[PDB]
């Protein structure tokens with residue numbers, strides 16, 4: 001089944017998921033000179049004060065930090081969105097080396113990793129129904145560069161030992177995702193897809209212009225996770241990113257001048 005290796009990586013996905021070659025796939029390169037300022041965009045509203053994290057899981061492709069999404073507790077609205085989208089999970093994509101790992105690129109620049117905060121449109125009732133809709137998800141994408149540590153990341157890095165291999169989970173309550181955000185909420189936005197199978201075309205992407213800094217030792221800990229399950233040969237969880245896909249008939253809009 002699908003993964004990030006030579007025989008089951010991104011170039012193979014289209015055989016099980018033909019939407020891989022669709023009209024609104026992600027990630028894409030963000031050409032900053034070509035992205036037009038849209039003064040009708042709103043400021044993004046990120047309301048995470050009531051966020052209830054539950055659990056962290058190694059799903060064999062990434063780790064997910066999951067939230068209670070059974071009430072409007074941690075929501076994204078405004079920016080390019082109509083309506084209210086509820087946080088369900090976040091995860092990252094990262095490299096084996098600091099020079100690669102992000103999925104979106106900015107004038108072809110790759111960051112060391114990229115955080116995805118995944119939210120579903122509450123007009124659709126749940127995540128499953130939302131992913132059948134072209135406006136079912138909003139993902140806030142935040143780039144990571146290696147420099148100073150991000151203190152708000154450390155509780156995630158510290159628990160990774162406990163979910164080393166595929167299928168492991170751990171209790172992960174009272175984590176506050178506000179500690180993962182940069183200062184500015186200036187962003188680029190375009191219609192896209194999940195960047196992992198099933199690659200569904202449901203996503204309003206909102207990609208923050210300002211990266212966060214994480215330390216070398218923090219990203220080193222991501223790279224000790226494993227794609228395999230316990231008892232199988234060790235294959236380090238690195239380079240779980242999809243390269244940029246054709247922009248096709250899409251315009252990337254900037255919320256800022």
Ligand SMILES: Cc1cccn(O)c1=S
Pocket residue numbers: 116118137139193194195196203
């Ligand atoms: C939106 C989303 C959901 C599940 C996995 N991944 O990678 C993404 S980007």
Ligand SMILES: [Zn+2]
Pocket residue numbers: 091092093116195196
């Ligand atoms: Zn993702």
